[PDB]
Structure formats: C-alpha cells, structure tokens
Design a protein around this nucleic acid. Sequence first.
RNA 1: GAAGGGCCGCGAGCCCCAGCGCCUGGAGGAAGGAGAAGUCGUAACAAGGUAUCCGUAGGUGAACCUGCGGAUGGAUCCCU
RNA 2: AUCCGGUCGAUCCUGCCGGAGCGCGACGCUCUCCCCAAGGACGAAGCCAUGCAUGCCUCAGGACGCGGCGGACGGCUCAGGACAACGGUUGCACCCCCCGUGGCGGUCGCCGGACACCGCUGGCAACCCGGCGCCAAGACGUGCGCGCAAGGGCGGGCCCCGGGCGAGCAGCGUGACGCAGCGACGGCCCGCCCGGGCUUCCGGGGCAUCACCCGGUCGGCGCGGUCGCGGCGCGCCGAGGGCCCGACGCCUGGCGGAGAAUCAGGGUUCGACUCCGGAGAGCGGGCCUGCGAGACGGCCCGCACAUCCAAGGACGGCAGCAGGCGCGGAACUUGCCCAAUGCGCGGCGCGCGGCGGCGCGACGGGGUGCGCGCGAGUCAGGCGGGCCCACCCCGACCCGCCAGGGCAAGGCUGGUGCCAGCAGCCGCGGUAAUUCCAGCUCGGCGAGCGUCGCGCGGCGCUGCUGCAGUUGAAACGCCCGUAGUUGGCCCCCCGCCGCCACGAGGAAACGGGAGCGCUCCAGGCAGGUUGGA
RNA 3: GAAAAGGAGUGGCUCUGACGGGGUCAGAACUGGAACGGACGCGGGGAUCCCGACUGUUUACUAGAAACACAGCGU
Lengths: 166, 142, 163, 258
Amino acid sequence: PRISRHRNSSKTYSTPKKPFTKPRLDAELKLCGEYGLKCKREIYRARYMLAKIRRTARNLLTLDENDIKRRFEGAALLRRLHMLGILDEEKDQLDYVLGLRIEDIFKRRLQSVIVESKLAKSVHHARNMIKARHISVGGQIVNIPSYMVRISNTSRVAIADTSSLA
Amino acid sequence: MSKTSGLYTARKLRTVRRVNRWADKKYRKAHLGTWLKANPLEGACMARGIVTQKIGISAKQPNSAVRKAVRVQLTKNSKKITAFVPRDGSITYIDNNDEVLVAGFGRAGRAVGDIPGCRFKVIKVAGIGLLALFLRKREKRA
Amino acid sequence: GITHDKMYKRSKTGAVQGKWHKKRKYNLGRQPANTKLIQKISTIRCRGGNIKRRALRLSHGSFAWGSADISHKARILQVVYNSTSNELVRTNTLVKGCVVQIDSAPFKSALSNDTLDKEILDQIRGDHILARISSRPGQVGTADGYILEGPELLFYQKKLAPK
Amino acid sequence: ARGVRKHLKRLNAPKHWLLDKMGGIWAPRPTNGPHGLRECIPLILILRNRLHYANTYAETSMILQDKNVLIDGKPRTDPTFPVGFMDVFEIPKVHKTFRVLYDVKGRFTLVPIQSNEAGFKLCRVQKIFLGDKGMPYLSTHDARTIRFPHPDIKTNDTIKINLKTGKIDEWYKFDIGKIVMVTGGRNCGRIGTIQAIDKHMGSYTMIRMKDTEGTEFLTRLCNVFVIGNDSPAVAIPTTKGIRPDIIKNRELRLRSIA
RNA sequence: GAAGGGCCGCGAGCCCCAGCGCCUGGAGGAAGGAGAAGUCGUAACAAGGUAUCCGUAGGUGAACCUGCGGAUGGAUCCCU
RNA sequence: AUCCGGUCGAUCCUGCCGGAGCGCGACGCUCUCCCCAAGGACGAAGCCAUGCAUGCCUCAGGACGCGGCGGACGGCUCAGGACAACGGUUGCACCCCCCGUGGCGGUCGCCGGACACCGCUGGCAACCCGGCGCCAAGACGUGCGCGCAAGGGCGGGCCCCGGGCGAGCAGCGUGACGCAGCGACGGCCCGCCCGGGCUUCCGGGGCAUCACCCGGUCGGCGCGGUCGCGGCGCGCCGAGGGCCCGACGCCUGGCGGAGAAUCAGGGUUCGACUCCGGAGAGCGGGCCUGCGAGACGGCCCGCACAUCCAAGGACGGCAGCAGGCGCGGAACUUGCCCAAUGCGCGGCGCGCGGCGGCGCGACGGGGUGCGCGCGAGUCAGGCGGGCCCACCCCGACCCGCCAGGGCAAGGCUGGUGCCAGCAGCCGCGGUAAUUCCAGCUCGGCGAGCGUCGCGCGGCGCUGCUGCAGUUGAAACGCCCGUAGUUGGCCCCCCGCCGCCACGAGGAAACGGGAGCGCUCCAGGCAGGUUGGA
RNA sequence: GAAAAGGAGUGGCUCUGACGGGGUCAGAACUGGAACGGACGCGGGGAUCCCGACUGUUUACUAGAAACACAGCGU
Ligand SMILES: [K+]
Ligand SMILES: [K+]
Ligand SMILES: [K+]
Ligand SMILES: [K+]
Ligand SMILES: [K+]
Ligand SMILES: [K+]
Ligand SMILES: [K+]
Ligand SMILES: [K+]
Ligand SMILES: [K+]
Ligand SMILES: [K+]
Ligand SMILES: [K+]
Ligand SMILES: [K+]
Ligand SMILES: [K+]
Ligand SMILES: [K+]
Ligand SMILES: [K+]
Ligand SMILES: [K+]
Ligand SMILES: [K+]
Ligand SMILES: [K+]
Ligand SMILES: [K+]
Ligand SMILES: [K+]
Ligand SMILES: [K+]
Ligand SMILES: [K+]
Ligand SMILES: [K+]
Ligand SMILES: [K+]
Ligand SMILES: [K+]
Ligand SMILES: [K+]
Ligand SMILES: [K+]
Ligand SMILES: [K+]
Ligand SMILES: [K+]
Ligand SMILES: [K+]
Ligand SMILES: [K+]
Ligand SMILES: [K+]
Ligand SMILES: [K+]
Ligand SMILES: [K+]
Ligand SMILES: [K+]
Ligand SMILES: [K+]
Ligand SMILES: [K+]
Ligand SMILES: [K+]
Ligand SMILES: [K+]
Ligand SMILES: [K+]
Ligand SMILES: [K+]
Ligand SMILES: [K+]
Ligand SMILES: [K+]
Ligand SMILES: [K+]
Ligand SMILES: [K+]
Ligand SMILES: [K+]
Ligand SMILES: [K+]
Ligand SMILES: [K+]
Ligand SMILES: [K+]
Ligand SMILES: [K+]
Ligand SMILES: [K+]
Ligand SMILES: [K+]
Ligand SMILES: [K+]
Ligand SMILES: [K+]
Ligand SMILES: [K+]
Ligand SMILES: [K+]
Ligand SMILES: [K+]
Ligand SMILES: [K+]
Ligand SMILES: [K+]
Ligand SMILES: [K+]
Ligand SMILES: [K+]
Ligand SMILES: [K+]
Ligand SMILES: [K+]
Ligand SMILES: [K+]
Ligand SMILES: [K+]
Ligand SMILES: [K+]
Ligand SMILES: [K+]
Ligand SMILES: [K+]
Ligand SMILES: [K+]
Ligand SMILES: [K+]
Ligand SMILES: [K+]
Ligand SMILES: [K+]
Ligand SMILES: [K+]
Ligand SMILES: [K+]
Ligand SMILES: [K+]
Ligand SMILES: [K+]
Ligand SMILES: [K+]
Ligand SMILES: [K+]
Ligand SMILES: [K+]
Ligand SMILES: [K+]
Ligand SMILES: [K+]
Ligand SMILES: [K+]
Ligand SMILES: [K+]
Ligand SMILES: [K+]
Ligand SMILES: [K+]
Ligand SMILES: [K+]
Ligand SMILES: [K+]
Ligand SMILES: [K+]
Ligand SMILES: [K+]
Ligand SMILES: [K+]
Ligand SMILES: [K+]
Ligand SMILES: [K+]
Ligand SMILES: [K+]
Ligand SMILES: [K+]
Ligand SMILES: [K+]
Ligand SMILES: [K+]
Ligand SMILES: [K+]
Ligand SMILES: [K+]
Ligand SMILES: [K+]
Ligand SMILES: [K+]
Ligand SMILES: [K+]
Ligand SMILES: [K+]
Ligand SMILES: [K+]
Ligand SMILES: [K+]
Ligand SMILES: [K+]
Ligand SMILES: [K+]
Ligand SMILES: [K+]
Ligand SMILES: [K+]
Ligand SMILES: [K+]
Ligand SMILES: [K+]
Ligand SMILES: [K+]
Ligand SMILES: [K+]
Ligand SMILES: [K+]
Ligand SMILES: [K+]
Ligand SMILES: [K+]
Ligand SMILES: [K+]
Ligand SMILES: [K+]
Ligand SMILES: [K+]
Ligand SMILES: [K+]
Ligand SMILES: [K+]
Ligand SMILES: [K+]
Ligand SMILES: [K+]
Ligand SMILES: [K+]
Ligand SMILES: [K+]
Ligand SMILES: [K+]
Ligand SMILES: [Mg+2]
Ligand SMILES: [Mg+2]
Ligand SMILES: [Mg+2]
Ligand SMILES: [Mg+2]
Ligand SMILES: [Mg+2]
Ligand SMILES: [Mg+2]
Ligand SMILES: [Mg+2]
Ligand SMILES: [Mg+2]
Ligand SMILES: [Mg+2]
Ligand SMILES: [Mg+2]
Ligand SMILES: [Mg+2]
C-alpha cells in the first residue's frame, strides 16, 4: 500500500443536538460579537476541547487521593492547563478543572492577548492586522488568528520588526 | 420475578431474546429478507428506466387534485413502477421513451400524502436534474 | 494423486464435511512395492531428498538365532503364513512379519554343539528352518530376520498343522 | 506461502527495534546465523540509524565491503547480520570497542570497553548432547558448540570464551545466589540475584530475583543469563539495571529540558 | 534403451436415471384491498323495538334465524 | 443521563406514525487560497486489443553460449469453505527444511568423450527445427583414500519410585548383511536458525413449517503407504459413535481476527480493502523440476470461449500496472524513475516501492476587510527536486443552498381560485390563500448546502441493568410429570471446583497516555547532555 | 401399491474360509471371438377415463359381461 494510507486524521468539533433553539442561539451570536468569529465551528471546536479535559477530570476524580494515576495525570493536566493559561496559579487542585468555560479558552488567543496589550484598536482590527502579518510572537512571525499563546511566550508579543509599521 | 434469574440462566436469557425479536415489525422488516426481495429497487438508493406512459392520479379523500406521474420500466430487472413527477409544470419534460432516474419519497417505500399507489419519484430526465430543469439552470435540447 | 488428507473423511458424528482447498503435494500417497520373492531395488526420491529403497524380487536375507547367538545368510525358500490374508501367502509376497522357510545349509554346523534347542536341531537335520521377517521391504529394500522359538514357534507350527 | 519468508513489513518489525512508522513500507529482515530474529538488532540498524556513520543503505554496504566492522573478533560483510547480547563491537578506524547489553526498557545498548576487556565472551549453556560416535557437545545461546566439555559444566550455566582460540577458560554455576541479568519478558535488562528456583513437573520452572535496592521480580528460567558470582564479570551501564518508575522518569524528562 | 501394447491407480467429459431447490404459462374457480355515491333489506349501538355475547349443530337472497349448555362485559349488588 | 407534533365537544392514557443528532455511499446546485488524503469491492471470480510487470554473475576484444543463484519471496482478489478457517493455548518420547552461523572431516598418481555459441549446407505461410564439423570447465562420468550410510538380532530392573529427562530416552558394545554418500580446485555429516506440517484445550452464523442422524460410520488386530502419527488405505473382528447443553439437514447478496460506526452506564450493527492468517489464478483434474510448488507472468488433458493462417497447421489466460468493452446509482493517466525503502543477485534489475497527473468521498487551516494596509494573481532569483513543479524565502507590478402556519429560528403586494400546485406528519387551496406561483423584506448553516438509501441514537417500542399481561395486545380448561432451573438452618482451622487480587508469557498499527511550538492545525516522532516512558 | 419404475453380476479351472459325515453360503487368482439362466423352462412397462367393490356364477352348440350372486343395509 502507498505509505500515505497509514496517516492519522480526526474531526475536532461537535454540533449541538437541537439546532433551532432561541435562548442560546442568541448568546451564541453574542460570542461572535465579543470576539471576531467567522462562524459557529469555532464555538463548536472550543466546546470540543473543553469536553475532553472535563472527561479526563471526571475519570481521575472517580479515583482515590493516594493513587498513581491521579498522581500522574492530575499533575500533568494542571501543568498543561496552567502553562496554556487556561488555569491560573492559585488553583492547584483537580476539582477546579470542572468550573472552567469556553471563555477562558478564548482569552488566550492572540486576538485577545494583543487587545490586553493594546496593540490593536479593537478585536476586528486585531483580526485584520493578524492576517496582514504585522504582529510577531517573540521574533517569529505568526499568521494564525486562532494561535494559542503560552504565558511564557506572552511577554514577547509585539509588531513583527519586518513590517511597514516600524 | 416474571423473568428468569439465577447465575446459570444465560442460555435461557438468550433464547428468549432471540425468539421475541421477530415480534417487532421493524426488526422483522429489516432482517427477514422478504422485503429485500419484494423491493423493486433491490435495496438501493436509486435506479434507472425508460418511460412507457404519462398518467394522472386523482388525489385521496380529503384533498382534490390530479397529480402527475409516469409508468416506468426498470432497466436492471424489467419491472413496472409508477413515479410521481413533482414541481409544477415538469410533466412536459418527460417524453414517451426517456432514460429517467428514480429515487424514493422517504418512509422506506410507503405512500406519502394523498397520492395513491406511488412510492417512487423521478429526479433526472435524459441526464439532466429535474430540480435545475424546473429552476431554468439547464435545458433539454429540442 | 493418491492422498491421505483427512478432509475427505466425515466427522465423528457422521456429517459430510466441506472442501476448502485443492490437493496439497505434501499429502501424497504412492503405490506399494508388493515385493515378490526370488534382484531389483529401486530408488525413490522423497520429500527433501531422502533416498528410499524399494524392493522387488528379493532372494536372500541375514537370519539370527538368538538363544544360541548364531547369524548366517540364507535363501528365502517359501512364504508360508501371514496374519492379514491368505492372498499374500499364496503369492509369496514379502512383507514385514510374514513367516517363511529358509535354507538349512548355513546353520548345519550348529548341529554339532548339543544342549541346544532340539526343536531347532531336528529341523536343521531336515532342509529348512522356520523364521519371521522383521524388516520393511518396501521402505528399506531388505528382508532380514530371526529364527522362531518359544511359545511363538509352537503357535505357528499348530497353524501349519496338516489340518 | 510456498516457502521461506524473505520480506518484512515495517509494522511487523519487533517493537524494540525502535523503527518509525513512516519512512518506508519495508524493514531489513535479519539473516540466519549466530542469533535469532526476535532477540537481535541488525548491523545496519546499528550503524546507519544510530551512529550516522552512514546516512543510507548504499553507503553502509561499502563500509561493510572494505571490511570495517569486527564482530566477535572476526569481520562481517552482511548488512542484515544479526548481532545480539554479549557480542563485541569494535571498529578500529574510530577506535571504538563495545559489548552489547540490554537497557532497562528491553533495548540494545553498546557499552564501551577496553582492550583488556574484549578478550572474552560470555555464553549461556543451552544444552548438552551426543553427536558422532558418542561424543559430548555443549551448544549455547550464541550458537557456539564445544566438544569434550568438562563434566562440571552443566545445562543453564555460563561459560567464558576466547574469541581467537575458541576454548573455555572460566565457567560460572547457576545456583541460588548468583548475580544475573534478564534477557526477555517485561523485566528485560534488569539485574539481581537468584534467590528462588521453583520447579514444576512437566511445565516451566520459575525464577525469583531481587535488585540491590530490594525490588523483586519473577520470570521463566529461559530468561536468566548469569554474569558473575556476587560480582559481574563484564561491564554494565551506569544505570546498572535498576528501573525507575514512571513518575521518576517523568521528572527526569522534565529536568533534561529544564 | 524409443515408438507401440496389457492390467490396475488417479480422475475429466458425456450419457442415462433418479433426488433437491428456485422461478414461471394456464381455461376455469375463489378470496382480499382501494375508487367508488349503483341496487336490496335493517343485523348492532337506547330494553335498538325478540337483552347482547361465547362453544357447538342445523337452516335461510343477504345481513341473519333456531335448538342445547355457558357468561354479565345486563336491563338486577335489595326479601319464609 | 433532555424531548417534541399527529385519535376528543373537551379530558387522562396505551400505542404507533412523523420530527430533531452523528457516520457511510449515490444524485442535484455552487465554488477564492494552502496542507492531508480515499478512489471498478457492493448476488459481472464477466470478457480482454496494446505495451510493460524478473533478472544478476565457471570456462575466451567482446558479445553469444555453457554453467550457477533466483524466479515457491514480492503484487492482486475474496469465488469457494460454517465443529472449517481463524483467535488465544499446548505438543511432536510421531516429523521435514535452503541460506547463514558454529562445529566435524580416518572411508572394505593429473584421466575419459561430448554439448551448447560458432562455420557449411537446408525444410517451413509462420510457429519452430533438421544434417555434417572443428573447440573448455568451479559441467558431467569414473574415480587415487586410514572402513562405516540406512535398516535388522542380542545385550534392563522379575514390593513401586548422570550424556539427558517428569517420563527406558539417547549413545555404545557384539554377532550378521550391504557398499550408499564424500573424493580430478574437500565434503559427506551435526547442533542453532527462520519456515512448514500435523496436533491438545476454550471461543467459533440463521432456520424446528429441519427430530432423529451416521454406516470407514465408532472401536480392535495386522500390514502397506507417508517426512511422519492417525480408518489415511486395505484385510479380518466387534457394534459402536452424535443428539432439546439443539445432533443431522437446509439457507447465506458467509473470508476470520487485530478492528470500525454510534454514545452517561449496560449495549446495538458492520467486519470488501492498510497488519497478521487462510484460499484461488476461466472451471474439473494430473504432474515435472527443485530444500521448498499439486506453481498457472511452468508443462499435460477434458469443457466453455476467443486468435493468426497459403486450409496443411500453430496458439491464449490482466482476481499484476495503466487502458478498453459490458454491467451498474456508483470508482482517475494507455505518465517519469529505481534517487530513497526493501528484496534479488551484486551496481544492476525491480509497474515493490517512489515522484508528478485526474480527484468538493472525506479531513485541517485561512479570506471576501479594517479605517487605510494586505493576499489572490504577473514577472525575476533562490531553496527543493532522479528531471519539473507545489510549500517557504527575497525584488519590482497589483458568497451559495434551503426556508419564513405548527413541530422549528424567520411576515406586505400582485396572480390563481379544491385548478395548477404545496405538503416527511398535522394540514393548505372553493374567485380578502400567514402554506401554491412571484416581488420586497427577514431566518438558518456557510465553500459548502439540499434530496435519496442504510447503520447507530432517539426507544425503558426488545427491557441483564430495565417493559407489559383484571378491563388497552397478552396467564396454557385442569392435575401428574422427565430434561432444565432453583432449593431452609447447622460444624472451621482439611481437600477439590467457582470467585477476588497480584503476577508470568505472547504484535505492531489503532485506542488512550508522558515529553516535543510541523508559524497554529488535521499531524509526525521529533529535537537542543537527549528522547520515542 | 411392489417383481412398481429401473440398474449390476452369473461359464471353466486352481484355491481359501464358516457351520456338526454333509452340503450349503461367502471370498480370491488364472483363463476363454468382448462368453456364460449358452438348449429347455420363463412378467413387457408406464400416465389416465368409464363400469362393477372384492373371490365366485352364466346363455352344453355364435353372447363370460357392465348381467346373476355376495357380505352389509332397510322394510
Ligand atoms: K411481567
Ligand atoms: K417483565
Ligand atoms: K418467564
Ligand atoms: K444457583
Ligand atoms: K419477552
Ligand atoms: K495428492
Ligand atoms: K491450489
Ligand atoms: K506441497
Ligand atoms: K496469501
Ligand atoms: K512447502
Ligand atoms: K523455501
Ligand atoms: K508497514
Ligand atoms: K510502514
Ligand atoms: K535479508
Ligand atoms: K540501489
Ligand atoms: K400458478
Ligand atoms: K367518485
Ligand atoms: K338480534
Ligand atoms: K331480528
Ligand atoms: K331486530
Ligand atoms: K337475547
Ligand atoms: K344489548
Ligand atoms: K341470544
Ligand atoms: K347459538
Ligand atoms: K342442530
Ligand atoms: K330453518
Ligand atoms: K333464516
Ligand atoms: K335469517
Ligand atoms: K329459523
Ligand atoms: K339467532
Ligand atoms: K343467537
Ligand atoms: K325457526
Ligand atoms: K323453530
Ligand atoms: K341459540
Ligand atoms: K340437552
Ligand atoms: K360460554
Ligand atoms: K370487560
Ligand atoms: K440512553
Ligand atoms: K402532527
Ligand atoms: K396530539
Ligand atoms: K375517548
Ligand atoms: K397519547
Ligand atoms: K466492479
Ligand atoms: K468487477
Ligand atoms: K469483486
Ligand atoms: K449488497
Ligand atoms: K530455483
Ligand atoms: K519459480
Ligand atoms: K521465494
Ligand atoms: K485492483
Ligand atoms: K470469500
Ligand atoms: K459470495
Ligand atoms: K529456501
Ligand atoms: K535467499
Ligand atoms: K489441534
Ligand atoms: K483440539
Ligand atoms: K485444536
Ligand atoms: K473449540
Ligand atoms: K431453528
Ligand atoms: K469395511
Ligand atoms: K490402521
Ligand atoms: K477396511
Ligand atoms: K466393520
Ligand atoms: K440448530
Ligand atoms: K458475496
Ligand atoms: K441490550
Ligand atoms: K454504552
Ligand atoms: K459498554
Ligand atoms: K440504546
Ligand atoms: K442507550
Ligand atoms: K477502499
Ligand atoms: K487484502
Ligand atoms: K485483510
Ligand atoms: K497485509
Ligand atoms: K499477510
Ligand atoms: K498470508
Ligand atoms: K493473504
Ligand atoms: K492458497
Ligand atoms: K478456483
Ligand atoms: K484457470
Ligand atoms: K480453477
Ligand atoms: K487445476
Ligand atoms: K494434482
Ligand atoms: K492441478
Ligand atoms: K475479483
Ligand atoms: K474479478
Ligand atoms: K500507472
Ligand atoms: K451504464
Ligand atoms: K450510465
Ligand atoms: K532504489
Ligand atoms: K507505479
Ligand atoms: K499588498
Ligand atoms: K505577491
Ligand atoms: K498592494
Ligand atoms: K502595495
Ligand atoms: K459575491
Ligand atoms: K414551495
Ligand atoms: K420520513
Ligand atoms: K411531524
Ligand atoms: K387574491
Ligand atoms: K430502540
Ligand atoms: K437507554
Ligand atoms: K410486569
Ligand atoms: K372489553
Ligand atoms: K387475541
Ligand atoms: K394458565
Ligand atoms: K403455552
Ligand atoms: K401441567
Ligand atoms: K406438577
Ligand atoms: K412434580
Ligand atoms: K438439573
Ligand atoms: K431457566
Ligand atoms: K441447579
Ligand atoms: K426453589
Ligand atoms: K476467579
Ligand atoms: K510485530
Ligand atoms: K465360475
Ligand atoms: K358383474
Ligand atoms: K381366486
Ligand atoms: K366375474
Ligand atoms: K351366442
Ligand atoms: K357365453
Ligand atoms: K370373465
Ligand atoms: K363391463
Ligand atoms: K346371469
Ligand atoms: Mg505495508
Ligand atoms: Mg336486538
Ligand atoms: Mg332487542
Ligand atoms: Mg480495488
Ligand atoms: Mg471479519
Ligand atoms: Mg506468479
Ligand atoms: Mg495486457
Ligand atoms: Mg448505471
Ligand atoms: Mg432500547
Ligand atoms: Mg365383478
Ligand atoms: Mg354359447
């Protein structure tokens, strides 16, 4: 067989069960307003990634406090959530992995980082400037709007010094 | 308990299930094969044939209308069916020997609405989709 | 060809069993030697090499008298008994286990030393001795053996009685 | 099939060969000889994939043509040559002499040694038998044979061999209390002391060892190679056959980047 | 030692007979279903104008009628 | 871990019908940029024009030929086959094996003629061959040699229990046969190895409108054949063997597993194709050569089909790669390269395998603006690449598809007047239509939307978890009764099952899962003392 | 129904086994124009319709049947 038959691939979003439901059909465009979202697949994707960390946490929390699998994956899960900035330092217990939301995932996009840093007038301006290739992340130039910035790479957001803007 | 129990009754709990599944009309309809036989399409999404006559069908008891249909002779097994031509005015695009493509109404071969005896419909005539043909996106030659 | 595959036999409940391949070479059978008494030894090439000697028309063999511990060579004279069938006796066909008469001339110097089995000595005074074939003529191209004694001798003499 | 197998798909290759699932549809298939097909690692996969002496098959071949690879004191020219446990690996142009041992995850490591060390070979006595005209032979785990063996040498013990003259100088006895290293199983690469040899009629005999920090383990007697007598006769890697557990390993993988 | 021949072992192909499916023609005959607004009566629902209904047997254009035993789901929870 | 609409004058139920989600294909409409990627499997295992798919190196400039090694591996497909095969788990004290590794090597004076390539003459329509002749061996043949191939007779203990074992197994000795193999460039032979054959146990489709079934069938003795055991075969003797814990028979649009789809838990359904195992090469059969084949890119015959031909004859097997026909709702080029990966032989060969082409099956990422700068294209140079190109880098120019009465988010003018038409289900339409046909306006998801068929879910409408049986569908008219299922209380601290835990031993890939910024990402196993736990 | 329908073997000679002197039954090798119940003796078969249930009786000398009788049934 050609060697390409052996590559893995996978879907990254889940579509809600009841589509035509007014109350959250409204709070769903509210999110497309408070950030610059092309369509609903980027809310679906955020729900998809929150669901998995929730499922892992419930699996671990069924278990017992002195157990090895807790001692392994709880520490791993908290470390990766803290370094992505989905969870902050003061909450170092697994039971806090349950009370997150989509919004704290959205907070660490570049479009949010540069608006905290005030590098763009707004979020829609931030989007257009992202694709114009004008903002770099620590000396390397990042074309991605959905880019997820570790709080280590979060001090080094700025204009890309090769740009019409220095 | 009106059901058998006890650690050594697995064989009976399986015999009961196997016998009682056939009392469900859907399980029997999808697993007995007599429908797979009686099905004019022989278990497919669609099939083609040649038109043998154009007919009109008088609607069922509450409504009143003359729906439009064609008697189709299937190519793959030489059977007779009737297909409802949808979408106002389309019955003109179905000549007396045409290769037409036939699919279903839904409901796995049950009559729909008020059209008696018809479980199929035509979706393409002479290589052209009838939706676009109605919508003036393609045109039959002459 | 001839085969000894089991797939053509029934199960242990009597049911016809199905057929899921074509004859394999490694289950072949061959026809048998049917070694006639009284000098050919064919060669057969078996699986992986392995010369097999296949006899036709043997005349002599090496025969051992055990209790006296004397061996001589001798000319098979006649096949007289066989446990399977009278047909292999009537045709003088050399197979393992058959009982034959051998020439007495080689063993006539044992007629001197006394305190020996008189049932062997008086038979040496004649002109043959009764013996059994111990080898497989169709597999190794040879027919050697031992002279009978014990209850077994008496058993075969009674089978040979003038009834 | 209708005969022997020549080819070998990459996925069907042994897991401990550490091949990568991309980079081909085929794998090198080891050739018959001094070791098997499962408990070995070929010469090409050592040179080309480990040490980068060659970046390709087409130039590993020529390294083996002008005879640059001494295995067990004798050269080799076959890329698919199976080198295994305790074999000596000396290339002179780069001044490197090794012996093959197992790591503590069941993989093949090349330990550096000295010219006072590459003069002998440890073999496991697989069996004692009789050949032509009634003579005794000992056949071992490296497919060496020794005739007229000293009667004290019995099955499952270990011998020490000279690579040049091919004769036995020392032997070690498999008893209760011998320093020994495993070669298969899920404790492959671990070293301990024989402290139980439990026998069973008809079936396999089981062996129970312990490291020098108290951790104990079990295996079949087919997987217990003897290395010394309360002291190893050959060198062993700076981990010495003690396995960490998953969390200790994880902190080390954290440290190496920290 | 070749061609060629004799007997058996393996085993095509065809013939011939029986089994075993599955599909299909057919004068007649007899059901079921839908379009129906066609005749003839009025069996049921009220004590439906002879309370209704079960089993069985017979009889009549049709629904149905009648005999023998049963039931209330009856039109009666009620009397030396 | 969720419901909704459809049986009334109104009302509570049962119960189905219809709607709402994911996936697989097919059809319709539409299409800016990049990355990944499946693709004549679907009761046609139907038929094939054309080309290619297997070669590489002892004896003389070289070819040619001889000799040798390989062509039994690799590729394709799923027709047959349901106590098979297959999966785990045993065994061979019933076996066979090339290459390679390590051993071992004792065997009762340089020989002989002849074959192909080639020379001279030929037959034939073409297919293919004849006759004569001069020439080699790491080719045969014979063989120089210190006796040892197969098989066979005797050499065991008459409570029972190291050469090697759990196990009387393997050697040796000694009486007879025989003369095999190795020797004209020293190898017969032996351990290991990978591979095979068979073999123990447990798992291993539907139908009872298939209840009895089998007769080398079940066992015993003896020979034969086999690499070998065995009713495997043959002779003789006996009457066994399987079965409601489902035999036997029939059917399958039956390849098995690793796995995949769905989604609280328990479950349902599918296992064409990536790895492993099996089986076949149009359909029955037979066989030669070889360590290894019942081989079809080997041969021989019967059948069904086709091909050239001067009419006498010869000849084929795409379920190999491309391509054609036919079938069907349904599936791409009659490309270039052996540079990597591997295998063969040895520097080459390889339609393995790779690299481009077709490719809205499907996956992942980014736009159609923001308040004033970009990508999409064009032209140049790198980088990469067997040769081009795509990605990256530097220079100069520069939506659409469905709907708007309810289920279910979204409401005025004209036309038509139970017509035409809509409508999955309720229902709409009778000359004032919230539903048809249109215009305006608004809703939905969005480079993708809609229609059709099927699987899972919805469904506690298949119920082990967990349904119902007075009247809605449903307790056999009753009593006895075998198989089956179930069975009070008691002694603890023994043995044998069940059960619970923890191990050992065997495959990756997939599924999870630790670490790692392909700019992110679907990914991959990277990478800056390392690592792939 | 039924010997349904349909198939195969069968001579001579040389032997072998089973039954408690006596033949029968079973098996094998060889052999003959490709023959064998070698003369003799000795059913052709099947699908249906009408009548009478059946075995039996009758027009000696042109009619053997569907006619008579019959068991059973009834008066
Ligand atoms: K119940
Ligand atoms: K129940
Ligand atoms: K029950
Ligand atoms: K019980
Ligand atoms: K039930
Ligand atoms: K055979
Ligand atoms: K075959
Ligand atoms: K074979
Ligand atoms: K295969
Ligand atoms: K084989
Ligand atoms: K082979
Ligand atoms: K692979
Ligand atoms: K691979
Ligand atoms: K190899
Ligand atoms: K190469
Ligand atoms: K009929
Ligand atoms: K009407
Ligand atoms: K009445
Ligand atoms: K009446
Ligand atoms: K009345
Ligand atoms: K009444
Ligand atoms: K009434
Ligand atoms: K009545
Ligand atoms: K009545
Ligand atoms: K009556
Ligand atoms: K009457
Ligand atoms: K009446
Ligand atoms: K009446
Ligand atoms: K009446
Ligand atoms: K009545
Ligand atoms: K009545
Ligand atoms: K009356
Ligand atoms: K009356
Ligand atoms: K009555
Ligand atoms: K009465
Ligand atoms: K009654
Ligand atoms: K009632
Ligand atoms: K559920
Ligand atoms: K409804
Ligand atoms: K309703
Ligand atoms: K009601
Ligand atoms: K209801
Ligand atoms: K196809
Ligand atoms: K096909
Ligand atoms: K196919
Ligand atoms: K199908
Ligand atoms: K070969
Ligand atoms: K071959
Ligand atoms: K091969
Ligand atoms: K193919
Ligand atoms: K198949
Ligand atoms: K099939
Ligand atoms: K081989
Ligand atoms: K090879
Ligand atoms: K087995
Ligand atoms: K078994
Ligand atoms: K088995
Ligand atoms: K089994
Ligand atoms: K059944
Ligand atoms: K028999
Ligand atoms: K036997
Ligand atoms: K027999
Ligand atoms: K018998
Ligand atoms: K069954
Ligand atoms: K099939
Ligand atoms: K279930
Ligand atoms: K579940
Ligand atoms: K489950
Ligand atoms: K379910
Ligand atoms: K469920
Ligand atoms: K496929
Ligand atoms: K396959
Ligand atoms: K497969
Ligand atoms: K595979
Ligand atoms: K395979
Ligand atoms: K295979
Ligand atoms: K295969
Ligand atoms: K096969
Ligand atoms: K076949
Ligand atoms: K064929
Ligand atoms: K075939
Ligand atoms: K064949
Ligand atoms: K064959
Ligand atoms: K064949
Ligand atoms: K096929
Ligand atoms: K095919
Ligand atoms: K191609
Ligand atoms: K077509
Ligand atoms: K077509
Ligand atoms: K290559
Ligand atoms: K190719
Ligand atoms: K620009
Ligand atoms: K540009
Ligand atoms: K510009
Ligand atoms: K510009
Ligand atoms: K536009
Ligand atoms: K419409
Ligand atoms: K529907
Ligand atoms: K509905
Ligand atoms: K109007
Ligand atoms: K359900
Ligand atoms: K459920
Ligand atoms: K109940
Ligand atoms: K009722
Ligand atoms: K009923
Ligand atoms: K009852
Ligand atoms: K019952
Ligand atoms: K009862
Ligand atoms: K009872
Ligand atoms: K009872
Ligand atoms: K029981
Ligand atoms: K039960
Ligand atoms: K029980
Ligand atoms: K009980
Ligand atoms: K247990
Ligand atoms: K593997
Ligand atoms: K005769
Ligand atoms: K008469
Ligand atoms: K008579
Ligand atoms: K008469
Ligand atoms: K007359
Ligand atoms: K008369
Ligand atoms: K008469
Ligand atoms: K008559
Ligand atoms: K008369
Ligand atoms: Mg592969
Ligand atoms: Mg009345
Ligand atoms: Mg009345
Ligand atoms: Mg294919
Ligand atoms: Mg499967
Ligand atoms: Mg082939
Ligand atoms: Mg071709
Ligand atoms: Mg078609
Ligand atoms: Mg359910
Ligand atoms: Mg009569
Ligand atoms: Mg008369």
